[PDB]
Amino acid sequence: KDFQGMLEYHKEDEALLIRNLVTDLKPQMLSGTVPCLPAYILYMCIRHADYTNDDLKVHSLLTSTINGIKKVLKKHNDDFEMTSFWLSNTCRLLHCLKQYSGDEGFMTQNTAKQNEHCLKNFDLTEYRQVLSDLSIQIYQQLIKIAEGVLQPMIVSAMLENESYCLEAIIRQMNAFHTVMCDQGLDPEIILQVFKQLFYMINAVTLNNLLLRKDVCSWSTGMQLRYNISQLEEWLRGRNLHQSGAVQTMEPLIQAAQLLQLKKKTQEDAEAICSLCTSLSTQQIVKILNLYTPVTVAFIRTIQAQLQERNDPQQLLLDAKHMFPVLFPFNPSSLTMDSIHIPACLNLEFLNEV
């Protein structure tokens, strides 16, 4: 019957809709069609509402929605899968609003058939600002989960020799990546996640060797450098080096080197300075004092040069520092004119129109 890309519900069942399509929607439901069918399916409804000029239907549809995404988010703070899921979905529902209600500004990459599918009667920039605000919050939640999973693995998989090993950490990083990719999450958010996680690994580890028993040794310098390089080769293999995540470890790379570099003669001390640029002069001196196989006056010559470059600053780098998110628009090629809505979901009460 020549389906336009649209769907109508009875102004009522809006509840039913939002529950079967959000609340009771488990992602392991594949989809099988679209990792973010929900996002699309919703826009197809926004469209039917724009068609009818039913501003009450739009405002209600995406405020019920946000209530359901927030709801289910809170009943799952803990699970990386759902957050991952509802993060990309949210994000796509936002990409669709930009891609279709948008103006010539976002219509620079649409097929006529796409520029035909756009919203004609509403400007939904207000909800566009709300959904992005939300998906900043979902991302934060996702970092909270991932941090929870990794925190108890960082100091063990690194710094100890041998119940966690760089294998566990690297198995985790795959798990996280796998789910995110399978969820259809944009590749720039995947890149932004692993830059966060790696920064934590740098912060939590370097914190520890500025504290522990007591900073550890030439041995511990060599496991870090190996560990980082295995993390770095992991990045190169999943093609995530351009995420900036290896940069987020230059203090640890320098700490590790600080532990191996020769500490004695002056020529030695000259080195420590020119290499350890990313560490603070009290962090170096600390890692010096804590060493265990360094003398004062080998320390004095050090702190003699690095005079405010730069110290002090709060030691113990708060790994919770959460770098800002950024969701570059990314329109999609798929067209709602052909999109599979399975039956396994009881959305039949939707009319194809």
Beta bridge partners of 351: 8
Q: Which two tokens stand for residue 106?
A: 């976002």
3-state SS, 220-260, equals HHHHHHHHHHHHHHHHHHHCCHHHCCCHHHHHHHHHHHHCC
Dihedral-angle region of residue 89 (phi above 0 means left; psi in -120 to 50 means alpha; beta otherwise): alpha
Q: Which residues contact 14 (CB under 8 A, 6 or more apart)?
A: 57, 60, 61, 64
Cα–Cα dist 21/26, whole Å: 9
Residue keyed to tokens 């990546």: 177
3-state SS, 110-160, equals CCCCCCCCCCCCCCCHHHHHHHHHHHHHHHHHHHHHHHHHHHHHHHHHCCC
Q: Which residues contact 237 (CB under 8 A, 6 or more apart)?
A: none
**This structure's resolution (angstroms)?**
3.1
Cα–Cα dist 153/168, whole Å: 8
Q: What is the residue extent of each domain of the chain? A: 1-353
Q: Centre a 10 Å sphere on the Cβ of residue 152 and count the other Cβ atoms it contains.
A: 11
Answer whether 214's CB lies under 8 Å from 164's CB. Answer: no
Residue whose C-alpha is closest to residue 144's, from 235, 203, 76, 67:
76
Helix axis angle, 55-74 relative to 80-101, nearest 10°?
160
Q: Centre a 10 Å sphere on the Cβ of residue 240 and count the other Cβ atoms it contains.
A: 21
Q: Which residues contact 74 (CB under 8 A, 6 or more apart)?
A: none
Omega cis (within 30) before 102: no
Helix axis angle, 166-182 relative to 187-208, nearest 10°?
160
Answer whether 132's CB lies under 8 Å from 117's CB. Answer: no
Backbone angles phi, psi at 351, to 5 degrees: -100, 120
SS3 8: strand
Residue keyed to tokens 């068609």: 51
Q: Is 4 exposed, middle or buried (0-12, 13-18, 19+ CB in 10 A)?
A: middle
Please spell the DSSP secondary structure of 15-72, one letter per residue.
Answer: HHHHIIIIIT--STT--SS-TTHHHHHHHHHHHHHHHTT-HHHHHHHHHHHHHHHHHH
Residue whose C-alpha is closest to residue 253's, from 230, 228, 290:
228
